[PDB]
Amino acid sequence: SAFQAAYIGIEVLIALVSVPGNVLVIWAVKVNQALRDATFCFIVSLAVADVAVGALVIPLAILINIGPQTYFHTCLMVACPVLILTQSSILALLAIAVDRYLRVKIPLRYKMVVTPRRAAVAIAGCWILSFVVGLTPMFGWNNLSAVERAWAAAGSMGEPVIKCEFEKVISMEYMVYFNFFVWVLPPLLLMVLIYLEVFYLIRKQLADLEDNWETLNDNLKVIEKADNAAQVKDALTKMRAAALDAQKRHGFDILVGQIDDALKLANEGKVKEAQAAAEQLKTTRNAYIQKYLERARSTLQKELKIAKSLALILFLFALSWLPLHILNCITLFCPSCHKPSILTYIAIFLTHGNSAMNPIVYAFRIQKFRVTFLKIWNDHFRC
Amino acid sequence: SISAFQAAYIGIEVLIALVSVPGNVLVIWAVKVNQALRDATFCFIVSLAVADVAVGALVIPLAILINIGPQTYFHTCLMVACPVLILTQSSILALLAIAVDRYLRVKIPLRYKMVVTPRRAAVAIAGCWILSFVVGLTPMFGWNNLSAVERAWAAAGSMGEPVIKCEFEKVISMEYMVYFNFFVWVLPPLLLMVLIYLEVFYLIRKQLADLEDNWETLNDNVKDALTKMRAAALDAPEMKDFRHGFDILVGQIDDALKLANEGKVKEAQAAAEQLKTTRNAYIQKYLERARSTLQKELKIAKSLALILFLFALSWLPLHILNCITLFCPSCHKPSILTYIAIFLTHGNSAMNPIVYAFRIQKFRVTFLKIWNDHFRCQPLEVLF
Ligand SMILES: *S(=O)(=O)c1ccc(C(=O)NCCCn2c(=O)n(CCC)c(=O)c3[nH]c(C4CCCCC4)nc32)cc1
Ligand SMILES: *S(=O)(=O)c1ccc(C(=O)NCCCn2c(=O)n(CCC)c(=O)c3[nH]c(C4CCCCC4)nc32)cc1
Ligand SMILES: CCCCCCCC/C=C/CCCCCCCC(=O)O
Numbered sequence: 001s002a003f004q005a006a007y008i009g010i011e012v013l014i015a016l017v018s019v020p021g022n023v024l025v026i027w028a029v030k031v032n033q034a035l036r037d038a039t040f041c042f043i044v045s046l047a048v049a050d051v052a053v054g055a056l057v058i059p060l061a062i063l064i065n066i067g068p069q070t071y072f073h074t075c076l077m078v079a080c081p082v083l084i085l086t087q088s089s090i091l092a093l094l095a096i097a098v099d100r101y102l103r104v105k106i107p108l109r110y111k112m113v114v115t116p117r118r119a120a121v122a123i124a125g126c127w128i129l130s131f132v133v134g135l136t137p138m139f140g141w142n143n144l145s146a147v148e149r150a151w152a153a154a155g156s157m158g159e160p161v162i163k164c165e166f167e168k169v170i171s172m173e174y175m176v177y178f179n180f181f182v183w184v185l186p187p188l189l190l191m192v193l194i195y196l197e198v199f200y201l202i203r204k205q206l207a208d209l210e211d212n213w214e215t216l217n218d219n220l221k222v223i224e225k226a227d228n229a230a231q232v233k234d235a236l237t238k239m240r241a242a243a244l245d246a247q248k249r250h251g252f253d254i255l256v257g258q259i260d261d262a263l264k265l266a267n268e269g270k271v272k273e274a275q276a277a278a279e280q281l282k283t284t285r286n287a288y289i290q291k292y293l294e295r296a297r298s299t300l301q302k303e304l305k306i307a308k309s310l311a312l313i314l315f316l317f318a319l320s321w322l323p324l325h326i327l328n329c330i331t332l333f334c335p336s337c338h339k340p341s342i343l344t345y346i347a348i349f350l351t352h353g354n355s356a357m358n359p360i361v362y363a364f365r366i367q368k369f370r371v372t373f374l375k376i377w378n379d380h381f382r383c
Numbered sequence: 384s385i386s387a388f389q390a391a392y393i394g395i396e397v398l399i400a401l402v403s404v405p406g407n408v409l410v411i412w413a414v415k416v417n418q419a420l421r422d423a424t425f426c427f428i429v430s431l432a433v434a435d436v437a438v439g440a441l442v443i444p445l446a447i448l449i450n451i452g453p454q455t456y457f458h459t460c461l462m463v464a465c466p467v468l469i470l471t472q473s474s475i476l477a478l479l480a481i482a483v484d485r486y487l488r489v490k491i492p493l494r495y496k497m498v499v500t501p502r503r504a505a506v507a508i509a510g511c512w513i514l515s516f517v518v519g520l521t522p523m524f525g526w527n528n529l530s531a532v533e534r535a536w537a538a539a540g541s542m543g544e545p546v547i548k549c550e551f552e553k554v555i556s557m558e559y560m561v562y563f564n565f566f567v568w569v570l571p572p573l574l575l576m577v578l579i580y581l582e583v584f585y586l587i588r589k590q591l592a593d594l595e596d597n598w599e600t601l602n603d604n605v606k607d608a609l610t611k612m613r614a615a616a617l618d619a620p621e622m623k624d625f626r627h628g629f630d631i632l633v634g635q636i637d638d639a640l641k642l643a644n645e646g647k648v649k650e651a652q653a654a655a656e657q658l659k660t661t662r663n664a665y666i667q668k669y670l671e672r673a674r675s676t677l678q679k680e681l682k683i684a685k686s687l688a689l690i691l692f693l694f695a696l697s698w699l700p701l702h703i704l705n706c707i708t709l710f711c712p713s714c715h716k717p718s719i720l721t722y723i724a725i726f727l728t729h730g731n732s733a734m735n736p737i738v739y740a741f742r743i744q745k746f747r748v749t750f751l752k753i754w755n756d757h758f759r760c761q762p763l764e765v766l767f
């Protein structure tokens with residue numbers, strides 16, 4: 001009794017935290033034009049899936065818990081929404097990971113590559129494939145034949161009426177081989193790899209800017225204290241090459257022009273005059289080049305900042321979801337093994353609970369959601 | 384071992400669905416892309432289209448599956464019967480919204496934009512669907528023949544839930560269909576809409592009549608003429624040109640009137656010639672633009688009315704059939720009359736897109752653009 005009330009209460013509480021948060025996430029993206037980006041469009045899809053868990057999956061579980069025995073088909077139908085919705089989440093996250101990859105990987109062609117319509121197609125695909133994976137049990141892959149044998153062996157007519165249990169209607173072979181090994185693990189590992197790559201790229205790109213910045217300062221010391229024009233030329237050419245790398249506009253025009261005006265001397269062989277260019281290059285550097293460096297730093301570090309937040313979401317997803325899979329694997333491979341009910345129950349509470357986390361982590365980590373949620377709260381949900 | 388009649392039913396259903404789904408998807412497409420259709424009326428036409436897409440994509444397939452399929456549990460047949468009830472109810476309320484929107488424009492044109500706002504239109508839409516789900520899901524809450532079938536199942540002497548040939552009249556209560564759905568949730572909306580449109584026409588025809596009255600008053604027409612011209616003027620980027628056309632006119636009417644106090648006709652003819660120049664210079668624009676904008680209000684109203692007429696004409700037979708089955712269970716009614724009634728209702732989901740294309744100019748131009756830009760296969764036309 002009190003345990004059932006506790007289950008129902010915890011479920012109700014998880015649902016009560018889940019639904020408003022994700023509705024608020026979906027709200028936040030619609031109102032705010034600063035969140036009109038591919039990443040956020042997938043966060044809306046991911047939020048929608050979480051709203052569906054709290055609004056549909058958790059109520060069904062409670063209704064099945066408090067309810068009577070059901071037909072096989074009834075229990076089979078009720079088992080699928082969570083399979084669809086959980087699958088949608090994974091693909092939605094994978095979309096976010098590849099979107100995060102593409103930005104840093106192909107920044108010049110990003111806007112022409114990743115377009116709203118393509119993002120929409122990608123979204124639609126996730127849901128289509130999610131319905132495909134989640135409805136597979138409805139097509140036939142289940143224990144119907146296994147239960148019909150026991151129903152006839154017991155000697156009962158018509159469709160099997162049973163206590164609605166997941167393991168009674170959904171095939172563990174399906175859950176382990178099809179769902180987990182094909183449709184969970186490879187996306188997870190691929191995403192885990194993609195993020196490592198995303199960090200690797202950003203850290204290297206940050207390193208390259210500091211490399212170019214230090215190269216440009218280091219060679220000014222070489223030019224200012226050089227004996228032979230050959231030393232100055234070797235500095236100037238590397239400074240130029242560094243400037244052409246750093247450019248990948250008009251500050252760089254003015255700089256590279258002054259490097260050419262310096263270089264022009266080095267062909268004749270006059271060091272004295274080359275010091276006059278060096279003083280101007282320092283003026284150009286401080287006039288123009290600091291801006292590019294600082295803005296590149298800030299915009300790269302902003303790419304880094306989000307990546308961590310989006311990674312944390314993946315970590316939380318994986319950490320929330322892996323237990324219930326491990327449980328499905330150990331039940332399949334070791335049916336002889338006993339596994340305590342509390343471990344089963346906390347695993348299930350973690351999965352439903354995962355629908356509450358995203359809105360909370362967005363509020364804590366992502367600045368633009370924080371400012372919006374406050375505005376929505378103040379303007380609409382304030383006492 | 385399938386009957387040619389069954390094949391014909393399935394084929395006609397499939398064809399109706401094949402005409403219905405693309406048309407309404409194209410209607411929903413047309414409103415989204417075109418900013419000229421970003422108006423309250425069209426926002427209800429999207430909701431009405433969505434309902435029709437659902438008939439062709441969900442209701443017609445379910446009917447075919449039930450037709451070709453086996454006997455079902457009572458609950459299965461009860462569940463499958465409801466979507467059409469929801470969707471049909473949505474249509475009526477969506478049309479009623481359109482009727483009152485058409486009324487409000489002509490009734491309160493000055494305050495229309497401040498009254499009928501996007502959010503209010505959205506709330507109104509949402510309401511239609513909520514109430515539609517309420518009316519349509521009522522049978523799922525309990526109002527059905529379950530107890531009536533359970534008696535016969537036990538009387539036959541069979542255990543468990545009733546398995547039966549899935550028929551509408553076997554699971555849905557006729558009392559519900561006649562008293563609740565038809566008498567409360569169909570007829571009053573229909574009659575109210577029928578009244579609203581008559582009023583909408585009445586207003587527009589009178590407003591058109593008044594402009595021609597003022598125009599004819601001005602052209603027929605010293606004091607008795609001038610006072611009527613004045614009275615007509617008081618009744619009567621661009622607003623500046625109208626304002627100033629009226630300044631130039633009323634100024635010349637004052638310059639004419641100035642003579643009438645003294646009493647000199649000869650000179651007043653000099654003003655009359657200038658007033659005709661002012662009329663043809665400025666006043667024709669106001670008249671013609673008012674004519675065009677009023678006649679555009681008239682043009683849509685007829686199209687939207689035709690949709691109501693077609694809806695009522697498509698839907699009333701199946702209701703009459705439900706009433707006569709309820710009140711006269713002894714009465715025999717031929718199957719063809721039952722079948723054409725049912726074909727009409729599913730068919731109604733195909734009509735709206737077709738009538739929009741024929742009558743409404745802005746949908747016609749859009750459907751062509753969507754066809755050309757997305758669904759064109761010109762190399763087949765070149766291939767011929
Ligand atoms: S209690 O023991 O009475 C009890 C009451 C209610 C519930 C419950 O809410 N169950 C819903 C979760 C069912 N379920 C799944 O939905 N999935 C799919 C996830 C996408 C599973 O993979 C799953 N595995 C299991 C168990 C776990 C270990 C024991 C055998 C399978 N349940 C799953 C539960 C208990
Ligand atoms: S044939 O006789 O085998 C046959 C095959 C298939 C169908 C069929 O597709 N029927 C679907 C229509 C069911 N139906 C409704 O949906 N509604 C609700 C409208 C919003 C009705 O009101 C309704 N009334 C009836 C009949 C009418 C005459 C006999 C009594 C009930 N069916 C309705 C049909 C036949
Ligand atoms: C018993 C199952 C019933 C199935 C009904 C299927 C239809 C589902 C309803 C969806 C709501 C559609 C809302 C459309 C609003 C359009 C708003 C707009 O014009 O922008």
Ligand SMILES: CCCCCCCC/C=C\CCCCCCCC(=O)O
Pocket residue numbers: 041044045048049052056077080081084123127
């Ligand atoms: C067996 C029945 C399964 C029912 C599953 C429930 C799913 C309901 C929730 C969402 C489905 C529609 C997907 C819409 C995605 C829109 C995301 C976006 O706005 O980008």
Ligand SMILES: CCCCCCCC/C=C\CCCCCCCC(=O)O
Pocket residue numbers: 120121123124127128131132135
């Ligand atoms: C056998 C497999 C069954 C497949 C059923 C199809 C399910 C499709 C569900 C939802 C499609 C719409 C998703 C929303 C796409 C729009 C994305 C956007 O523009 O934001």
Ligand SMILES: CCCCCCCC/C=C\CCCCCCCC(=O)O
Pocket residue numbers: 426504505506508509512513516517518520
């Ligand atoms: C009978 C009790 C159950 C009631 C359930 C009602 C389900 C409501 C479903 C959809 C309503 C939301 C429609 C959104 C309309 C959007 C309008 C707009 O913004 O254009």
